[model samples]
Target chain A: AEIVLDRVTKSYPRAAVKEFSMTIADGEFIILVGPSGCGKSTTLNMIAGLEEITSGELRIGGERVNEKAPKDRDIAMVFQSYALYPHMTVRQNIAFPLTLAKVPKAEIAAKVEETAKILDLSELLDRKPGQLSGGQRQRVAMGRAIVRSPKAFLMDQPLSNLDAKLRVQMRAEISRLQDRLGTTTVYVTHDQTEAMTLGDRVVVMLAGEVQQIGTPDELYSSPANLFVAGFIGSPAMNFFPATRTDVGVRLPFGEVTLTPHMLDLLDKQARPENIIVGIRPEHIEDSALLDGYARIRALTFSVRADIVESLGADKYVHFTTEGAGAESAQLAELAADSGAGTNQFIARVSADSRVRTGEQIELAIDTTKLSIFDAATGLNLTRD
Target chain B: KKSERRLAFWLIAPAVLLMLAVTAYPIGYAVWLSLQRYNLAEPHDTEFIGLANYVTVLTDGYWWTAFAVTLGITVVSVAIEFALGLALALVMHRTIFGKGAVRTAILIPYGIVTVAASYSWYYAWTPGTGYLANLLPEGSAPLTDQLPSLAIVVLAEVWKTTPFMALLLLAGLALVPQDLLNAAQVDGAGPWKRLTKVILPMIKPAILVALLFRTLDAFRIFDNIYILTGGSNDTGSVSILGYDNLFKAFNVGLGSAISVLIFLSVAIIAFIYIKIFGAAAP
Candidate 1:
């Protein structure tokens, strides 16, 4: 089923979600992700009919259903708590929706058995929710949602309560389940890794408005705004203030020559003289470690490494920049929220490099991978 | 093992001795008195009666009348109390406004002395000097009739004890997780089904506890009936009949026999509740 939110808005007396809209294609896996209190869960609840839409239209399978009750919406929701009935066994928990719908007793039994088989819960069918492990109980909750084969699935951070390892395992399991069922699924979570790995399309929300909606690669390579650029990556994108000069832009570390296409795009916009420059940590490489292909397209500079963190696959080198950081209000607020100081930036370099703390090292910057944004508006200047 | 058993017995000896002093001795003395013709009005007739007092008490019509009245009051009062207590417990559990005030106000009936509350109800129904009595039909007296007097006694019993029942149920309501109720709503259960299928089943232990306590307590209905009717018009219970025999009639032998029987009846009622309703130990 296709679910559409047409200019939907949810308003409280103090705060409101303004002009929210999305169309979930049939059998598509869509994710709503952001930091806490960003109205993602509220939007999901409104779609489930658990909360009323303050204004605008909600249609399910081409019928307007703003006034429909939750049960009448014919969509199953797996809650963050799992919400399994403690009094019932696993089989009975899975059979609850069918029992409520007054389906035939034999059919309910068959459907429950099938669901238990699919979730690998057949061995634990007779155990109550209290007696099962966290993962087993989660499967039973999923079994309950899928037993009826509803038109859509709404999940609100269903894996947030599990441990880290178990969350990764269940994340893949949920992705597999959605693929096999081909049900229109709307998932909500605050973890960007989960959003990137599990969603076919992700909608990043900030406060009450959507920041951007696109595929993982699109969001990673061509972010629409400063917030999306900073929020969508692990170890996040490093940003610094830059100014236009004769040949290129003058960055904190050194001058970065802009391509002709980047210069022309910059000239078309009537923006301020100053711009914000964003570089992914992966784009910055160790100069001594660069190969022939990377050497030709990179700009080399020297800086003292402040902190060196070694993982099995790579090294993250933190260094202090002499120039001031980006001065946009958006970047300032993000930095304040994250408790990050203004002068530090990190780069993912090759583990083979012998860069130690308090030692100076040459670093290579891939100039083509840089993104420039309007300093005042925080909009990406190098992307269409 | 032998030494351990001896130590255990020694550790419990004081409690055992205290229990014997308070309970076992009184019960044994009452049994001995029941076998003799001990009457304060006729001291010379204090001789061994050999089960004659038991037979006399068993065959008396007034004994049967009081037994029937006790059973009636116990069943009616407890049934009404359970319903009212559950409603009150739901209100207390779910109310967001002035919860502390509501809880304190509801507990006032439980904290008041039972005898004082019964007296208050008694005056409320009395014809001449009571405010509520003026609301009755003209020339009609409620306390003088058998049914109305029993009804008034039951009303007083229910009013005084429903709060206690509600408090027990409120504790049980707290044990039911709120998420389960929300899940039930998503599973297509309306309010009534949620109550019957989810809430009641989960709180069965609390309900059984409240019912067992109130049933046994209601079976011994003496204070309210005494203050209201004084065992007149066939409205006396087993406790009232025993009190009248021991104090008013001075038949110590008959009173002791009735006391033993009432104790046995209460034990039987408790056993039946635990056996049939499965009231688990809290």
Candidate 2:
């Protein structure tokens, strides 16, 4: 079912979810992601009808359902806690919606059996929620939602309750389930990895407002603002204070050549004293290993490698610049949110790269991949 | 292992001795006493009268009447309290406005001394001095009659104990995660469906606890009956009968028999309950 939110808002004296508007196409998996207190969960809650939309028109399947109760809304939800009925067996749990719908006895049992088979919970059906492990219980939760085959699925950080390795496996399973079922799904999570990997489209929110909404790749490659640039990637995008000029931007350790087109875009906003420039760690590579033609398009610089992490295919080298340039509030908050990393530039070199702890190495930054944001507004200025 | 077992027994010696000294001697002595005919008013006239006392009390009409009355108050009050207390628990659990105030207020009745609360109820149902008596019928004093007095007894018991019942059920209510209820709602459950299907089942252990506790407490009905009816018009519970026999008639052996019988009945009820709800009775 297509889900359309027309200027949805929720407030507890202050707007908890502010004028959130988005259209999720049929069979699209949309993710609402942000740090804590950013109201991503609140947005999902409103869409699920678990919360009252203070002011907005919500339509599911092209019919207004703003005033409809959750049961009447034809939606299903899975919670972070999995929220399995502790008293019910997995069979009963999966069959609950059907039972509530007063389906015939044979049909209800068959539907639960079928759902359990799909969720790979057939043998576990007789066991209660307490008897099952977290991953299994989460599977039961999913089974409960999908057994009803509701119009849409509202998942509230359902994968947040698993262990790290289990989270990855479950994330893969969820993607597979969503893709195969092709159900409209709205998943809310704070984990960017899930947001990046699971969502067909990701909506990055901050301070109860949407910062950007686009495909995960769109948000990754060209974020609308500095927050998304910092938020959308893991080993987050490296930010540095840069003096922007028509010809080039000067970094603390090096200078980046800019084309007239890129400068004109930057000029669209007033030329400030300094702007923040960001590049994903993956965009930086070992200068020695760069192809000749690729080397011509990249900027090369040398810095002492502080710490080197050999993670199989990729070697992550971290080294700080000469100075910790002017810090923006957004970056500082992002630092605190992600648990402040060492303010060092990272280069994702190949595993065979010679960079090691305390070794100086030449690194190349992919010039075209750099993200420039105005220091005052934190808005990405490089987009066409 | 034998020596370690001996050491562990010795480690528990103080509490065991204290418990035996305080409880076992009295219970065993009562059993011994029940086997004899002893008129405490005539101390010298005593004899081993095995099962005679039990036969006398068991055969007596007043004893069975009091026993039935005890069962009546226990069942009626517990039923009323379960319904009323469950409602109270739901109110406190679901209500947002003034939750702290309502919870504290509801719990105050359980804190009130049963003697004082019973006396309050006693006065309320009395003839001219009580306001509640005026609402029944002119010149009608419900506390002096049989059914009316038992009804008053039940009201007093339920009023004082419902808060405690609610408290236990409230604990059960807390055990139900709010997210679980929301999941139920999104799974197509309405308010009543949520209660019957989720809230009640999730809190079964708490309900069992509340029922077990209140049933035992209700069975030992004494204060309200003593203060209001004083065993008048066949409204006396078994405890009242025991008090009368022990203190008024000074028949120690017979009273001991009654005490043993009441204890036996209670033990049976508790066993039946624990057996019935054994799987979920945490």
Candidate 3:
């Protein structure tokens, strides 16, 4: 059944979610991704009936469940810590929900065995949770949830406790398990990588507000705002200050014009005077440009590089720039917050680019594929 | 070398002498006196009688009856106390409001002197003088006069030790992880199921320890019966038999035999408890 959150709001004494809302169609796997204390876990708990909503309604299978308890909501949860009963055997832990439902004893056993086989825990049926490894315990948690056959599943950072390699492995396993079960699932996580790869649709959040919601590709290709753009990618999208002129965007170092279609879109939005530009490192390339877009030249510096990280296909060069931008107040604040002086810039260059530390190199800039945003508000100023 | 060994021995000599004086001498004296007809009242008639006193005490009908009643009271009182204390512990463990006040109030009965508690019960169950006497049936005498004198003792012991049992059990309950309880609750287990499946099994070791201590204490009960009934009632306990034989009857050998019997019974209880629970440990 479809899960609909009707303007649900949750509040603590110090922090409150103001009028949060979302809808999940039946069998759709949605991920709630955000930084810590952004109310993603709270929202997931409300859906699981583990936490109460301060106001508004929650409906599962078209039935209002705001007042219902966790069990009554017909939902199972896999917690981040895998809160398994230390006293119970694996078989008993998995069969507990069935026993609570008054299912026949034999049926409960069969169901438990079946689920155990699926989770590859048949041999460890008699072992307590304390005896199992972290990965095995996580599988048992998932097995317990799946054995209940609940209408929906709520997982809160289920893979966050595992080692990095195991986390990646379990991430794929959980995604496959959700597909096999075809249950309406809402997973919460702070890892953008997990959000990008596992989520059928990712709901990005900031503070307690839903910042953006879309598929992984939609968020990557067309982010709704500056936060989504900076948050969704690794090494994050690079944001720099720029100004809108008759030609195009005038960056501190250079300027570039836009195509007619791009200009029309910017003009319709009543383009402001100052804008912030954003571009993923992968989008920036050292190549000859066409009309209205080309590389720019500025006062070159003999930069003594510090660290060069080689990532097989690409090399990220960490260099320092002299005399930080004094014109843009926003850029000045960002640079100050970063603790970077007049010099500090991490550039993703081609792997073949021989950029070494303690050596001077002539660095090239790509202006055609650069993005622009509003300077005052950190929103993308380019075509929506 | 000899001087150094002697010095080391001298260093530990006080502790060893104190241990023998406190422990070994009492047991040897009890054994020696058990075989002699030493009377405090008739000092001149004192004589050695070997094991005859032991045989006499073992075969006596009154002594047998007293032993049975003591065992019966011990079993009933301890069992009831264990169950009541377990329930109280579970309640106190879950309650957050005014819990400290309730806990303090429950421990008041236990903290009172045994003699004081017995006298209080004695006065409360007295004929027309006590508050409860007027409320009961006209012929209903004090609990000491009826078969329920044991019941009164049982109730008194239950009241005294249930708080102790709850206190110990609460310590064990504190160790149970809230995460396990939350998991059970989310898995659709009701309160009763969670208590039986999750809570009881976790606290079994604590209950066993409480039971062993309380059982031993209840089996050796003497002060309450002595104070309340004067040890004359048929419902009188085992320790009173030893007291009567040694003091009123001047049967020192028989008293020693009774003391030995009580010691043996308590030892047997300890053995059974250890056998059942000690092996379960890792």
Candidate 4:
């Protein structure tokens, strides 16, 4: 079923979730992702009718359901806590929705059995929730939701309570289950990796507002704002302070001229005196490992490697640059979250490159892969 | 291992001795008294009347009446208290405004002395000089009739103990997670269904505990009957009859037998509750 949020807003006495909107297509798996207290869970609750929508409209399968109760909305939700009835056996828990609907007794049993088999929980059918493991309980919760064949599934960080390994395993299991059932699912989580892996389309939110919404690749390559850019990736994008010169942007290392296409994009905006330059760690390479032609096209600079970490195939080289690195309120917040002090930069290089701590090393930057943001607005200028 | 066992026995010896001194000795002395004819009224007539006093107390019609009265009060009062307490618990759990005030007000009834509260009810239902008496018909004497007087006694018992039940149930209510309630709503269960299927099952232990406590307490109803009717109109409970035999009639042998019988009945009631409800002891 298709779900749409038409400029939905939720407000409390002191805090409010601003006008937010998105449309989830039929059978699509959409993810809401952000840091803690960013209103992702609130948005999911509003969709499920668990929280009142302060204003605007919500539609499920082309029907307005704002004033309707949650039971009348014909939706199922999986909570972060699993929320299994501790007094119930697994079969009873799975059959709860069907029982509530007053379905035929024989049919409820058959559907519960089928759901248990699908979730690989047949062996645990007779066991109560307290007797089951964490992963088993999570499966029981999912079984409860799917047994009803509702119009949509609203999941709020359903896999967050499991251990790391079980979380990864259940993540794939949930993805497969959603694909097999083809049910429209809206998932909420603070983990970006889960967001990137599971969402057919991901909506990144910040401070109760939608920052950007797109595919994983779109979000990573062309973030709408600095928050998305910093939030979407691991070991995050390294930013530097730069000034607009006559030929190009002037960095602390050297002046790198921009392409005519990039210059035109910059000219379209009111040209500011300063810009924030962002580049992902993977875009930086060891100078000795690059081919001569590629090396000639890249901007090469030398800095002392303060720390070196090897992970079998790649090496993360941490280095410090001169001057106050990058200065923007958004960048500052991102840096604080990353535990990175000012002037620190990380470069992901090939493991074969000989880089040691306290040693001077030459690093090559791909100028074409750089992101230029308007310093004041924190909006990505290089995003087409 | 023998030394360890000896040490364990020694550690528990003091408690065991204290328990026997307080409980077992009194019960044994009561059994001895029940076997003899010991009347404070005729001290010179004291003699060993082997089982005669037991037969006398067991066959008496007044004894059976008091037993039935105690049973009726226990059943009616506990049932009403459970329903009212659950309603009050739900209100206290869900209310956001004046929560402290509500809690304090409910607890006031529990904290007041039972005798004092019973006297208040007695005055309230009296024919001539009470506020509630004015609302009654001119010649209708509520506290003088058998049914209305029993009803008033039950009202006093229920009002004073419902708060205790509510407090116990409130602890259980807090354990029912809010997320589960939301999940139930999303699963298509309405409010009533949620309460019956989720909340009730979750708080069964607390209910059993509260029921067990209030049932025993109501079964031994004495203070209200003693202060209100003073055993008049045949409204005395088992405890009141025992007190009348020991104090008013000065028949120590018959009263001790009655006390022993009441103890056995209470033990049986406790056993039945624990067996039927399967309430785990905390």
Task: Find the candidate with the highest TM-score and give its number.
Answer: 4
* Model 1 regions lying over 4 Å from their true place: A244-247, A323-329, A332-338, B1-21, B40-49, B52-55
For candidate 4, state the interface root-mean-square deviation in angstroms to 1 decimal: 1.4
Please give the lDDT score at residue B22 for candidate 2: 100
Candidate 1 deviates by what RMSD? 3.0
Ranking by lDDT: 4, 1, 2, 3
In model 1, the clashing pairs are none
Ranking by DockQ: 4, 2, 1, 3
Candidate 2 residue B216 Cα shift, in angstroms, is 1.9
Candidate 1 displacement at residue B87 in angstroms: 1.3
Q: How accurate locally, in lDDT, is each candidate? A: 0.81, 0.79, 0.73, 0.82
lDDT of 1 by residue, A280-366 (tens): 887777767455776666777798888888875678988866776477777875664476677678888878777788888878887
Instruction: Tell me which of candidates 2 and 3 scores higher on lDDT.
Output: 2
Docking quality tier of model 1? medium
In candidate 3, which residue pairs get closer than 3 Å at backbone N, Cα or C atoms, i.e. clash?
A276-A373, A277-A372, A321-A343, A373-A381
Model 3, residue B42: distance off in Å is 5.6
- Candidate 3 on B1-282: residue-level lDDT in tens? 999999999999999999979987777777788878777778877676675668777888988888888888888988888889888888888886878888887788778887887888778888899887678888877575646677777776677778888888787679987766776766566678766778777787887788888888888788877877876668668887777776687766667777777778788879888895662331
Q: Write the per-residue lDDT of candidate 2 for residues B136-242, one digit (tens) a residue.
A: 76857887658867787888878988888887888887877777777666655667866687777777778887888888988887888887776878777889888
Question: What is the clash count of model 3?
Answer: 4
Model 2 chain A: lowest-lDDT 10 consecutive positions = A336-345
lDDT of 4: 0.82
Q: Candidate 1 overall Cα lDDT vs. reference?
A: 0.81
